């Protein structure tokens, strides 16, 4: 599932025994209840540009 369109994950994807898939997030992010989206948990998460985010 992870091979195709990142398994629908915003960030990381892990395949499980069968049709199961778990999305995961880099440190400084948490996975939303949709099971795919990553939301920052810290003030300066990696790979985000504050002057653009605050705009």
């Amino acid at each position: 599932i992870c091979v195709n369109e990142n398994g629908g994950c915003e960030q990381y994807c892990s395949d499980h025994t069968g049709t199961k898939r778990s999305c995961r997030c880099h440190e400084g992010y948490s996975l939303l209840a949709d099971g795919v989206s990553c939301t920052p948990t810290v003030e300066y998460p990696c790979g985000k540009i504050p002057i653009l985010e605050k705009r």
Partner: protein, 250 residues
């Protein structure tokens, strides 16, 4: 950087400037508060290991605006497979003596997982390359941080599209063969950053090429995805005496 534009101050917040005895050496990429990824070849000529400085939050080299943060480089970790003066395995992992403070102007770039980088990031066509390198082949280096959008090529395609070393599985080509746009030697070690679903990731390192923006030649970048496990294991390790460390690769 040839044929790019000034990176608006704070829009490249993971960019690192490496200095040796106060002189411009190379670029780098901040990946968390204490670790910087650069190119192994940046350190081939270093004798003064204690005069190596990393600057974060840099933009304009002519003025100090208060957003700059300087740190001594405590350790430079290079793969055992890298041979000085050659192109393969061109990566270095730098431990800062004290962490940088994250601010609107100092933010790490995400180091991705290998699977995500190989099966998704490797297929994002364009990525940004940046640095204070040459603005022209045989020309002056930039006073303001420059950025350039470059397309990635499959190695078979790079080899076919190039005029007149090998492009290994530890490298990838990106850029243009028409001599208009490229990263240069002074950008060495700098990031090749890829955007995916609202977040930027580290996919390449400014590594090598011919002249700068030479017709018939693309820029060659270290393929960071091959080093994820190697980097993660070193980031979990205790510091060792002496600045330079050669670490087994794989």
């Amino acid at each position: 950087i040839v044929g790019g534009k000034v990176c608006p101050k704070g829009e490249c917040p993971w960019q690192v400037l490496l200095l040796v005895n106060g002189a411009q050496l190379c670029g780098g990429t901040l990946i968390n508060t204490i670790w910087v990824v650069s190119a192994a070849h940046c350190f081939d000529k270093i004798k003064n290991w204690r005069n190596l400085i990393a600057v974060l939050g840099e933009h304009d080299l002519s003025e100090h605006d208060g957003d700059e943060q300087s740190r001594r480089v405590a350790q430079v970790i290079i793969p055992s497979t890298y041979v000085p003066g050659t192109t393969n395995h061109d990566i270095a992992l730098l431990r800062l003596h004290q962490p940088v403070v994250l601010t609107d102007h100092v933010v790490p770039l995400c180091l991705p997982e290998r699977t995500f980088s190989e099966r998704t990031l490797a297929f994002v066509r364009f990525s940004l390359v940046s640095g204070w390198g040459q603005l022209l082949d045989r020309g002056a280096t930039a006073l303001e941080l420059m950025v350039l959008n470059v397309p990635r090529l499959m190695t078979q395609d790079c080899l076919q599209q190039s005029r007149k070393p090998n492009i290994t599985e530890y490298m990838f080509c990106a850029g243009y063969s028409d001599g208009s746009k490229d990263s240069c030697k002074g950008d060495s070690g700098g990031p090749h950053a890829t955007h995916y679903r609202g977040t930027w990731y580290l996919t390449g390192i400014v590594s090598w090429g011919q002249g700068c923006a030479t017709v018939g030649h693309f820029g060659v970048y270290t393929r960071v995805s091959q080093y994820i496990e190697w980097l993660q294991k070193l980031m979990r390790s205790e510091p060792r005496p002496g600045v330079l460390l050669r670490a087994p690769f794989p």
